[PDB]
Amino acid sequence: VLTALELSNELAKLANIEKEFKNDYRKLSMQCKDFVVGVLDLCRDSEEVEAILNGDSLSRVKLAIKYEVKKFVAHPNCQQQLLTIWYENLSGLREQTIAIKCLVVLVVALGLPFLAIGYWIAPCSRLGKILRSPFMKFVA
Amino acid sequence: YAIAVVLSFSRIAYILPANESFGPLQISLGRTVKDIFKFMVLFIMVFFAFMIGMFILYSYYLGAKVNAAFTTVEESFKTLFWSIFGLSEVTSVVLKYDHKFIENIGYVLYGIYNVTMVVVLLNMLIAMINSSYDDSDVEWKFARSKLWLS
Amino acid sequence: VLTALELSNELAKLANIEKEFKNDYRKLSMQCKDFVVGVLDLCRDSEEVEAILNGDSLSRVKLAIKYEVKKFVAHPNCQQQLLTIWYENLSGLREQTIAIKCLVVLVVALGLPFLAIGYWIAPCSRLGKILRSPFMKFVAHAASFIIFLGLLVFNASDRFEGITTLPNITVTDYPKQIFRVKTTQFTWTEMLIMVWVLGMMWSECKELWLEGPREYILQLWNVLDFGMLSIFIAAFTARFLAFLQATKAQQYVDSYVQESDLSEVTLPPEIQYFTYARDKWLPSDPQIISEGLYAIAVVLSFSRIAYILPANESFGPLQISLGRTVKDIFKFMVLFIMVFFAFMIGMFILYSYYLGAKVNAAFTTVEESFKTLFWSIFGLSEVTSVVLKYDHKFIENIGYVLYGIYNVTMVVVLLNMLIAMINSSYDDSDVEWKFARSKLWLSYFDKTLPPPFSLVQPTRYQQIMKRLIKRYVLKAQVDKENDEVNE
Ligand SMILES: O=C(c1cc2c(s1)CCCCC2)N1CCC(n2c(=O)[nH]c3ccccc32)CC1
Numbered sequence: 001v002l003t004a005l006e007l008s009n010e011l012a013k014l015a016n017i018e019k020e021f022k023n024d025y026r027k028l029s030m031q032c033k034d035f036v037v038g039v040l041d042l043c044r045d046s047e048e049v050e051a052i053l054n055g056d057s058l059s060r061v062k063l064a065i066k067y068e069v070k071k072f073v074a075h076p077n078c079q080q081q082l083l084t085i086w087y088e089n090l091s092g093l094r095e096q097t098i099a100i101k102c103l104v105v106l107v108v109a110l111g112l113p114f115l116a117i118g119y120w121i122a123p124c125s126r127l128g129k130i131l132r133s134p135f136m137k138f139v140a
Numbered sequence: 141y142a143i144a145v146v147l148s149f150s151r152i153a154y155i156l157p158a159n160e161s162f163g164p165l166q167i168s169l170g171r172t173v174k175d176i177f178k179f180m181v182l183f184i185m186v187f188f189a190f191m192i193g194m195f196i197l198y199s200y201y202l203g204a205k206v207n208a209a210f211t212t213v214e215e216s217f218k219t220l221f222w223s224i225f226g227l228s229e230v231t232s233v234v235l236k237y238d239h240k241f242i243e244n245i246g247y248v249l250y251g252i253y254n255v256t257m258v259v260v261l262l263n264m265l266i267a268m269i270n271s272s273y274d275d276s277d278v279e280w281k282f283a284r285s286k287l288w289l290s
Numbered sequence: 291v292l293t294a295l296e297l298s299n300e301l302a303k304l305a306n307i308e309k310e311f312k313n314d315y316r317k318l319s320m321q322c323k324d325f326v327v328g329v330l331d332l333c334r335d336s337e338e339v340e341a342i343l344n345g346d347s348l349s350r351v352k353l354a355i356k357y358e359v360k361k362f363v364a365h366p367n368c369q370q371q372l373l374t375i376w377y378e379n380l381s382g383l384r385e386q387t388i389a390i391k392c393l394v395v396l397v398v399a400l401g402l403p404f405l406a407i408g409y410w411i412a413p414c415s416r417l418g419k420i421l422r423s424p425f426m427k428f429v430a431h432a433a434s435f436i437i438f439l440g441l442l443v444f445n446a447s448d449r450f451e452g453i454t455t456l457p458n459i460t461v462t463d464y465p466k467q468i469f470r471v472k473t474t475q476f477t478w479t480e481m482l483i484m485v486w487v488l489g490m491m492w493s494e495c496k497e498l499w500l501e502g503p504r505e506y507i508l509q510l511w512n513v514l515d516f517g518m519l520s521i522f523i524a525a526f527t528a529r530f531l532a533f534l535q536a537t538k539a540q541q542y543v544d545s546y547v548q549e550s551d552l553s554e555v556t557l558p559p560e561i562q563y564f565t566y567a568r569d570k571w572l573p574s575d576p577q578i579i580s581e582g583l584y585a586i587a588v589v590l591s592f593s594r595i596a597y598i599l600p601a602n603e604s605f606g607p608l609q610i611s612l613g614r615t616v617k618d619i620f621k622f623m624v625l626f627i628m629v630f631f632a633f634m635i636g637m638f639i640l641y642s643y644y645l646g647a648k649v650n651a652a653f654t655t656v657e658e659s660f661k662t663l664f665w666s667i668f669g670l671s672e673v674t675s676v677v678l679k680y681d682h683k684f685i686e687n688i689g690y691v692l693y694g695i696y697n698v699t700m701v702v703v704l705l706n707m708l709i710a711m712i713n714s715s716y717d718d719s720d721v722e723w724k725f726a727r728s729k730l731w732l733s734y735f736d737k738t739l740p741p742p743f744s745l746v747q748p749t750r751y752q753q754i755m756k757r758l759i760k761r762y763v764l765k766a767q768v769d770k771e772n773d774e775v776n777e
């Protein structure tokens with residue numbers, strides 16, 4: 001999978017450099033991307049999905065983002081893992097409606113100075129884990 | 141400060157990809173902006189051609205025109221730009237002298253400029269339509285995943 | 291390959307001639323083009339590619355360009371060979387970015403006279419090979435066009451912020467001078483503009499005489515270029531007659547009357563005419579005609595960018611789409627003209643009898659009716675164009691209804707034209723742009739100086755062709771077998 005990602009990037013760079021056989025190199029890079037996406041698609045356990053998404057820190061997801069391997073990142077096997085970290089330390093809030101999320105954003109907007117000053121003790125408190133989740137960082 | 145305040149609201153683009161409904165909208169906007177730029181370049185070329193033509197035609201009638209419209213480069217640019225959205229009147233090409241050759245040539249050039257602007261607008265719309273085509277879904281999910289990993 | 295090219299051309303001509311079985315002949319011509327493209331595609335060595343691209347001087351590429359075999363010219367096997375000649379004598383510059391190429395164009399624009407004068411020794415120097423490459427010829431021509439546009443803009447300087455004297459007032463260097471002499475005398479910049487315009491005229495006349503009038507007319511863009519050059523020539527001729535009249539007046543006034551100041555002189559009316567200001571010129575004054583034609587020529591000069599856009603990778607497809615749509619643009623403008631003329635005649639006939647009876651002179655003459663109906667398209671005419679000063683509500687209401695129906699019909703025709711353009715909009719665009727770019731390249735393959743500076747043991751080929759045709763037959767048979775091996 002790492003070999004296919006690197007080869008896809010190399011073939012895309014060659015497609016840019018040549019411009020004569022750009023279609024050939026783009027087709028080859030698409031072949032590499034398709035291979036990576038299919039190998040990810042074969043996964044049927046969390047262990048396999050993790051092994052694909054980071055090698056031996058989502059390393060392969062970051063590499064695919066860098067190399068514009070869009071179908072690998074957008075695959076449900078990767079998306080579920082990304083949502084796992086995204087909605088970390090907060091499980092019920094994932095299932096809430098969009099209106100509840102907007103209300104949470106409004107509450108955070110109202111009370112941002114209070115939580116900011118409480119961050120001096122938050123890591124020793126439970127609320128520090130809540131505010132340190134990626135979704136809460138985005139909301140903040 | 142006014143320009144900075146206007147540009148501040150552009151930071152919404154860092155938040156829309158997270159939303160499920162507006163993310164695809166931003167994706168389509170990004171899809172079309174690439175040919176928006178090229179057709180604005182074409183607009184600029186045609187606009188500059190007609191602007192130079194109008195200014196050269198009407199530069200010698202600063203006090204001889206009912207309306208100071210094409211008598212300077214600034215004024216020519218202003219009237220030709222605001223003719224795109226219809227905020228300039230047709231009396232921009234009327235003289236106070238009995239030179240029907242200059243006035244009629246100005247009329248013809250201004251009408252041709254309007255027709256050319258409409259034609260370029262329609263071509264840009266059709267190019268945008270062609271560039272518009274579950275690739276949109278994976279594109280939006282890629283953008284949202286980049287936002288998450290940030 | 292030559293047989294297939296010739297047969298494709300013949301079948302296209304038959305498709306045009308018949309028009310009953312046009313689809314059959316077009317399908318056959320497409321078959322011939324496909325055969326040629328496939329035979330080219332089979333090549334896997336430079337020797338084979340050359341043998342295909344020119345027979346036993348890119349002869350077959352030129353023939354395919356003539357016969358509109360677009361996929362053969364746009365094939366990568368042909369494109370790499372074309373880039374080889376295009377980027378000749380300059381290898382590193384091929385890999386440079388677009389910004390570096392633009393910087394090279396700017397440098398050439400700045401130093402064009404220096405390299406032009408150095409061309410007297412350049413063939414004996416290394417730089418002669420550099421400037422004689424097709425890419426450098428194209429860059430030199432683009433720089434020449436840029437310099438021409440710069441001259442056109444710079445000749446209008448000192449008026450960018452507006453003129454300082456009112457058109458009613460005359461300013462002369464010395465009292466003995468005729469005002470029209472000062473207004474018509476030539477400065478250096480428009481002398482260079484004339485030299486350049488004569489350069490492009492001489493070039494265009496060269497291709498016109500080489501190709502013939504009937505052949506040259508059939509290209510619309512070529513006749514557009516010829517018209518632009520002829521409008522420049524007409525404007526400068528009118529300026530020259532104005533200058534001749536002014537200098538005749540100056541000769542008369544200096545020869546005959548002997549006074550310190552010309553203002554006190556009561557000149558004869560023929561000589562006195564050339565002392566008046568802008569306001570008191572005749573409507574058919576030669577300088578008025580000169581300025582009017584010069585403005586149109588300046589506007590049309592910027593259309594020459596169409597000779598440079600196909601070289602660019604990003605704007606070439608844009609020009610291709612513009613050319614795709616212009617064909618139905620013309621037809622729907624014809625429909626616009628039909629509807630417009632119908633409504634114009636109707637409006638004029640309705641409102642011709644109310645010249646002094648209307649709040650606004652809008653449809654009282656053919657000129658006025660045309661003006662108001664044309665500027666209603668872009669919304670620069672008001673609705674009070676159909677209002678009378680008399681109590682004739684029948685005429686006024688009929689005018690209202692006709693004007694509203696005209697607006698609705700214009701909108702409907704516009705939307706239909708947009709939809710027709712959308713339908714006409716549909717990697718054929720890529721091959722079309724590459725065909726246009728290859729035509730641009732081959733125009734420069736075999737012109738070294740810009741128009742302003744132009745004033746001064748059967749056979750090896752038979753063996754290769756037999757090998758390629760054997761390859762084609764084997765590949766076709768293998769494809770047929772793989773299609774029907776099971777049966
Ligand atoms: O609006 C116009 C325009 C012309 C054109 C425009 S616009 C651009 C696209 C349409 C074709 C060219 N003009 C010019 C001449 C007009 N004009 C008279 O001066 N006498 C006339 C007698 C009959 C019909 C028209 C008359 C006055 C104003």
Ligand SMILES: O=C(c1cc2c(s1)CCCCC2)N1CCC(n2c(=O)[nH]c3ccccc32)CC1
Pocket residue numbers: 687690691692693694695698
């Ligand atoms: O603008 C209009 C237009 C009509 C139509 C136009 S345009 C074209 C497309 C729409 C249908 C035809 N007209 C005409 C008559 C109007 N009119 C009175 O004169 N008395 C009225 C009493 C009720 C409603 C309208 C009244 C005055 C101005």
